[PDB]
Design a protein around this ligand. Sequence first.
Ligand SMILES: Nc1ncnc2c1ncn2[C@@H]1O[C@H](COP(=O)(O)OP(=O)(O)O)[C@@H](O)[C@H]1O
Ligand SMILES: Nc1ncnc2c1ncn2[C@@H]1O[C@H](COP(=O)(O)OP(=O)(O)O)[C@@H](O)[C@H]1O
Ligand SMILES: CCCC/C(C)=C/COP(=O)(O)OP(=O)(O)O
Ligand SMILES: CCCC/C(C)=C/COP(=O)(O)O
Lengths: 234, 247
Amino acid sequence: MILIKLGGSVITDKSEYHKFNKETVSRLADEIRRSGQDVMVVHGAGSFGHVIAKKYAIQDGHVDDGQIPAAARIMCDTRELSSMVVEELLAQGIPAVSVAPGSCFVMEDGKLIVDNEEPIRRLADLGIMPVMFGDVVPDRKKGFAAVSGDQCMEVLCRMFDPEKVVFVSDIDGLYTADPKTDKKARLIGEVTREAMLRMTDRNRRCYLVNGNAPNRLYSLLKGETVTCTVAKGG
Amino acid sequence: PRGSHMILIKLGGSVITDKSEYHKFNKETVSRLADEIRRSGQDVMVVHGAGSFGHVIAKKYAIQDGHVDDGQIPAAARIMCDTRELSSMVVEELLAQGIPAVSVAPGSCFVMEDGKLIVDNEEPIRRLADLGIMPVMFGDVVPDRKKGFAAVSGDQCMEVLCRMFDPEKVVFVSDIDGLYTADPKTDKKARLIGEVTRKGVHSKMEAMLRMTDRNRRCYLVNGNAPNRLYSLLKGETVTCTVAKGGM
Ligand SMILES: Nc1ncnc2c1ncn2[C@@H]1O[C@H](COP(=O)(O)OP(=O)(O)O)[C@@H](O)[C@H]1O
Ligand SMILES: Nc1ncnc2c1ncn2[C@@H]1O[C@H](COP(=O)(O)OP(=O)(O)O)[C@@H](O)[C@H]1O
Ligand SMILES: CCCC/C(C)=C/COP(=O)(O)OP(=O)(O)O
Ligand SMILES: CCCC/C(C)=C/COP(=O)(O)O
């Protein structure tokens, strides 16, 4: 099994609120289907969550009552975005269903707690891929807290033990600095010296590939070599 | 428990969707129903059905029969996507009326067993309601502990939330003035049952009293009639079917 995260940087326009990149997700879902590999797809929120959370300081928790309608607005936006991603997967013959973390799990000390793993495992047993995503989750100490797609990878990595982990973003890989502001940073090949090291072991290798490059995710899922950042270690 | 003055409402699929055409959302009804809910000012928790967003495909692929062949797996995932997309449109109407709510799909967090919806983890639903974000459940394809997948109903989703929060009132919004002795669209001779107390109209009368006691009552009001849902929530008496007494 290969755990993939369709990051918000490719599936959405992180600078334009509520903007869905339909042609990108449609191509990425087609590349996943053409690879023929058993996968579990996660995706981020992008502008379907980050734009409103920053305006209302959702990352700070339940500060005042003015954040309650904004938190529900983000929750509705993330669930709406997941429907569009699932629609692209269903059109490519990939049964999947949206699993909102804010509707089934809780958060505490910055971690997503999965007290009941049965329905998620039963969904994967039916061939209907459970699709978690970045969302606002009820917090046990801060009222509510935001979970990212990265932690959803960490939770699903320890639960299903995938053979490979893939992070899909709008960058060819990890650089020494921001490649959009610093145009001198080099592409870092290996990683042994982010959180890609917490989901790798003896054989599991984490990858960071550019979803904006066509057929790059397809070749990476097929075992061929592509431009990316590979992580290894314990 | 906590919701001492809560009113439990079902926006049935016959009034929020057009069950004659697949994947059709009644925009003006849900917008009017949500506005009627807001104008009442009562603390409420909304559940809705699937209607044409689930019944059309479930009948064609026999989802009620369970996982018999692999051909129903893409059909089940399509129903789950349709019910989630419909729940977004309902929540989108509640957010416009100033009522913070979030979709809580049962098929993505719960399991079923021989027709019974199992809710082992009550923390997320209880935490959302306490925060002010109304958890919204609905009919959906739910993984079954024996039959692969099963179909949960909006009526069944209310039975879980009624025993979870112990609400003060229960309202069932449908496309009918109330419970009749027969089908009102077929039997032009059937009469309306005003009060349901002591005795498939037998199973329908028995289902309403299961969510009633000495104080809490169950109502079956018409959602296609404007201002009818708003009048009941404030305490006015309208054309409906009330269940009182409990069991
Ligand atoms: N050292 C770095 N290497 C690569 N990208 C970086 C680096 N530092 C900052 N970035 C920025 O982070 C962005 C990718 O992260 P992000 O878009 O948040 O991931 P996600 O796909 O989860 O949205 C890139 O657009 C890039 O501009
Ligand atoms: N005894 C009865 N009394 C009232 N309506 C009935 C009866 N038997 C069948 N019906 C039919 O059931 C329909 C509503 O049921 P349904 O749409 O399943 O409820 P909901 O959509 O709220 O789940 C009505 O259109 C009505 O014609
Ligand atoms: C305080 C954040 C609130 C917004 C939110 C739910 C974000 C999801 O996290 P995430 O998956 O990393 O988004 P993205 O990096 O893929 O765009
Ligand atoms: C899961 C299969 C689809 C049928 C369904 C959702 C029935 C329950 O909806 P409803 O009767 O409107 O409450």
